[PDB]
Design an enzyme around this catalytic site. Structure first.
Site, PDB file in Angstrom:
ATOM      1  N   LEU A  43      25.222 -93.148  41.193  1.00 19.96           N
ATOM      2  CA  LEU A  43      24.600 -93.232  42.887  1.00 19.96           C
ATOM      3  C   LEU A  43      23.417 -93.214  42.785  1.00 19.96           C
ATOM      4  CD1 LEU A  43      26.191 -89.705  43.273  1.00 19.96           C
ATOM      5  CD2 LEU A  43      26.457 -91.627  44.002  1.00 19.96           C
ATOM      6  N   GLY A  44      22.201 -92.891  41.736  1.00 21.85           N
ATOM      7  CA  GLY A  44      21.160 -92.850  41.342  1.00 21.85           C
ATOM      8  C   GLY A  44      20.023 -93.204  40.149  1.00 21.85           C
ATOM      9  N   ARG A  45      19.108 -93.929  39.951  1.00 17.71           N
ATOM     10  CA  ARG A  45      18.122 -93.028  38.428  1.00 17.71           C
ATOM     11  C   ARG A  45      16.356 -92.678  38.952  1.00 17.71           C
ATOM     12  NH1 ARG A  45      19.878 -97.291  34.467  1.00 17.71           N
ATOM     13  NH2 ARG A  45      17.891 -99.085  35.626  1.00 17.71           N
ATOM     14  N   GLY A  46      16.367 -91.855  39.070  1.00 14.39           N
ATOM     15  CA  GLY A  46      14.787 -91.523  38.530  1.00 14.39           C
ATOM     16  C   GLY A  46      14.318 -91.827  38.207  1.00 14.39           C
ATOM     17  N   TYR A  48      13.109 -89.760  35.447  1.00 15.14           N
ATOM     18  CA  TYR A  48      13.279 -88.739  33.713  1.00 15.14           C
ATOM     19  C   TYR A  48      14.688 -89.038  34.610  1.00 15.14           C
ATOM     20  CZ  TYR A  48       8.305 -87.685  33.369  1.00 15.14           C
ATOM     21  OH  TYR A  48       7.206 -87.942  34.225  1.00 15.14           O
ATOM     22  N   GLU A  50      19.189 -90.233  35.546  1.00 15.11           N
ATOM     23  CA  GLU A  50      20.115 -91.107  35.855  1.00 15.11           C
ATOM     24  C   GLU A  50      21.593 -90.125  36.713  1.00 15.11           C
ATOM     25  OE1 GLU A  50      21.911 -94.360  33.534  1.00 15.11           O
ATOM     26  OE2 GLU A  50      21.895 -95.503  35.284  1.00 15.11           O
ATOM     27  N   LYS A  66      23.853 -85.485  36.489  1.00 15.76           N
ATOM     28  CA  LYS A  66      22.553 -85.804  36.214  1.00 15.76           C
ATOM     29  C   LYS A  66      22.329 -85.722  34.813  1.00 15.76           C
ATOM     30  CE  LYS A  66      17.869 -84.101  36.840  1.00 15.76           C
ATOM     31  NZ  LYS A  66      16.814 -83.552  37.533  1.00 15.76           N
ATOM     32  N   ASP A 154       8.313 -80.332  44.496  1.00 15.17           N
ATOM     33  CA  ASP A 154       9.062 -81.451  45.455  1.00 15.17           C
ATOM     34  C   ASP A 154       9.644 -81.730  46.061  1.00 15.17           C
ATOM     35  OD1 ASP A 154       8.967 -84.442  45.723  1.00 15.17           O
ATOM     36  OD2 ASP A 154       9.982 -84.643  43.601  1.00 15.17           O
TER      37      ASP A 154
HETATM   38  C1  LIG Z   1      16.729 -88.013  41.910  1.00  8.08           C
HETATM   39  O1  LIG Z   1      17.862 -87.572  41.714  1.00  8.08           O
HETATM   40  N1  LIG Z   1      18.199 -85.982  40.481  1.00  8.08           N
HETATM   41  C2  LIG Z   1      19.224 -85.082  41.619  1.00  8.08           C
HETATM   42  N2  LIG Z   1      18.636 -83.668  40.511  1.00  8.08           N
HETATM   43  C3  LIG Z   1      19.572 -82.988  41.351  1.00  8.08           C
HETATM   44  O2  LIG Z   1      19.427 -81.741  41.426  1.00  8.08           O
HETATM   45  C4  LIG Z   1      20.579 -83.686  42.449  1.00  8.08           C
HETATM   46  C5  LIG Z   1      21.660 -83.135  42.369  1.00  8.08           C
HETATM   47  C6  LIG Z   1      22.065 -83.415  43.556  1.00  8.08           C
HETATM   48  C7  LIG Z   1      24.089 -82.231  44.132  1.00  8.08           C
HETATM   49  C8  LIG Z   1      24.435 -82.529  44.713  1.00  8.08           C
HETATM   50  C9  LIG Z   1      24.618 -84.324  44.539  1.00  8.08           C
HETATM   51  N3  LIG Z   1      25.783 -84.714  45.491  1.00  8.08           N
HETATM   52  C10 LIG Z   1      25.978 -85.070  46.115  1.00  8.08           C
HETATM   53  C11 LIG Z   1      25.273 -86.579  45.906  1.00  8.08           C
HETATM   54  C12 LIG Z   1      23.966 -86.341  44.954  1.00  8.08           C
HETATM   55  C13 LIG Z   1      24.181 -84.900  44.857  1.00  8.08           C
HETATM   56  C14 LIG Z   1      22.818 -84.288  44.122  1.00  8.08           C
HETATM   57  S1  LIG Z   1      19.676 -85.330  42.274  1.00  8.08           S
END
Ligand SMILES: CO/N=C1/NC(=O)C(Cc2ccc3ncccc3c2)=[SH]1
EC number: 2.7.11.1
Length: 327
Positions: A43-46, A48, A50, A66, A154
């Site tokens: 879905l993405g990468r921060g 800190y 993935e 995560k 944040d």
């Molecule tokens: C850089 O994003 N880091 C994260 N931290 C979290 O707690 C996430 C949690 C989360 C929880 C439910 C989700 N549901 C769908 C899509 C993304 C979702 C993301 S993503």
């Protein structure tokens, strides 16, 4: 030097608790089984971690995994302890499991999946009623975490997952969250530029839960005035100038005076002199339907330089802006 500050609510919540609650370093993680989860798509990468969409093969439920990078190091335990302390709280993302990722060799957090509609597409298309309704839902999460002695640090649209079809919301990404301890000096390199409070921008370290209320104010201003983002700084310095063009420089200098802050001299050549603008200056034909006297009074009480002067989350929930929301 700078004068100290304390939160005006939930001040000593952690001091009365057993050290086990807030001493995240001593926490022992209960590991789940990595084989219960099948990764489906990235879905993405921060900076800190993935993030992946996955399936919990033991119930066929969608989850999110995560995978933390090593850069987090010691801070991984803080996020896990905060998520476990807050689990079950209103609109707080549910940490379903913690497993050891086989490939990375670092911890992988498993969360409940939220079928979210992207903020660029969504938070700028909401009706007046829906802005009020979702703000009230975000405030339930913020009052809960603050009452539990935790600052999110944040708050921003990317960190609020909204299932609009089901009118459900979750506050996510607890990787910058911290336990509030009265008198503690914190790192100001938190939150994202557009949502950073003036305490961060002027390098005042003894901040508290009220930082999340400034960030929430910025989100409210962006939604009601249809301006993404509301305070559009080019860097952390220009960010404070953008705020001063709206709130004025006199209340900024009074804030710096009250807390005895040494303002970075680089601000002498850029801040200029500005007077507070009345909130009706930002109203126009495209956003007038989302603006009411109650919305402007509420926004005005969140967007204050003095962190001690902002509404708390519980006081915000009492505001007239929310009388129209079904409770
Ligand atoms: C850089 O994003 N880091 C994260 N931290 C979290 O707690 C996430 C949690 C989360 C929880 C439910 C989700 N549901 C769908 C899509 C993304 C979702 C993301 S993503």
């Amino acid at each position: 030097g700078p004068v100290p500050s304390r939160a005006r609510v939930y001040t000593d919540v952690n001091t009365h608790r057993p050290s086990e609650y807030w001493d995240y370093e001593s926490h022992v993680v209960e590991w789940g089984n990595q084989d219960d989860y099948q990764l489906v798509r990235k879905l993405g990468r921060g900076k800190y971690s993935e993030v992946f969409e996955a399936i919990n093969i033991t119930n066929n439920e969608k989850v999110v995994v995560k995978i933390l990078k090593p850069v987090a190091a010691a801070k991984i335990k803080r996020e896990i302890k905060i998520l476990e302390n807050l689990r079950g709280g209103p609109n707080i993302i549910t940490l379903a499991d913690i497993v050891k990722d086989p490939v990375s060799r670092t911890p992988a957090l498993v969360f409940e999946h939220v079928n979210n509609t992207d903020f660029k597409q969504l938070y700028q298309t909401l009706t007046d009623y829906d802005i009020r309704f979702y703000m009230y839902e975000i405030l339930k999460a913020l009052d809960y975490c603050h009452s539990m002695g935790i600052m999110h640090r944040d708050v921003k649209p990317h960190n609020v997952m909204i299932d609009h079809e089901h009118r459900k919301l979750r506050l996510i990404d607890w990787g910058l969250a911290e336990f509030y301890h009265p008198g503690q000096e914190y790192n100001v390199r938190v939150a994202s530029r557009y949502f950073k409070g003036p305490e961060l921008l002027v390098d005042y370290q003894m901040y508290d839960y009220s930082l999340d209320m400034w960030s929430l104010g910025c989100m409210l201003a962006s939604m009601i005035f249809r301006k993404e983002p509301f305070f559009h700084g080019h860097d952390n310095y220009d960010q404070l100038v953008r705020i001063a063009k709206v709130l004025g420089t006199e209340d900024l200098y009074d804030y710096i005076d009250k807390y005895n802050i040494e303002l970075d001299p680089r601000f002498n050549d850029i801040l200029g002199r500005h007077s507070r603008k009345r909130w009706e200056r930002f109203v126009h034909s495209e956003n007038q339907h989302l603006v009411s006297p109650e919305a402007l009074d509420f926004l005005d009480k969140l967007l204050r330089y003095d962190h001690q002067s902002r509404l708390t989350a519980r006081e915000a929930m009492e505001h007239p802006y929310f009388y129209t929301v079904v409770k």
